């Protein structure tokens, strides 16, 4: 509905070979009012 909603959560984990077999509920972060037809996306990585 023309809104970009981002939810997030940070959890301390030990076994890193895969995602943990636990249960953590993401909490709302932002509800930005952005009107676009998002179809593709890409991740940014730091290049020192």
């Amino acid at each position: 509905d023309g809104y970009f909603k981002i939810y997030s959560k940070h959890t301390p984990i030990n076994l890193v070979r895969d995602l943990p077999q636990g249960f953590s509920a993401l909490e709302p972060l932002v509800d930005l009012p952005i009107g676009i037809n998002i179809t593709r996306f890409q991740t940014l990585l730091a290049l020192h």
Binding site: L32, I36, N37, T39, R40, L44, A46, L47
Partner: protein, 44 residues
């Protein structure tokens, strides 16, 4: 090592595109008609 994300349609200046960068102590969310390069990365 992971800073942010970009969300768009053609990822060029033809159409508007979102972009999120995790500033060291801030956030730089901007939705503009960015002309994204073929290899986006945030250099320091």
């Amino acid at each position: 090592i992971i800073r942010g994300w970009i969300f768009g349609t053609t990822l060029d200046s033809k159409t508007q595109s979102l972009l999120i960068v995790n500033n060291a102590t801030n956030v730089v969310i901007k939705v503009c008609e960015f002309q994204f390069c073929n290899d986006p990365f945030l250099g320091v």
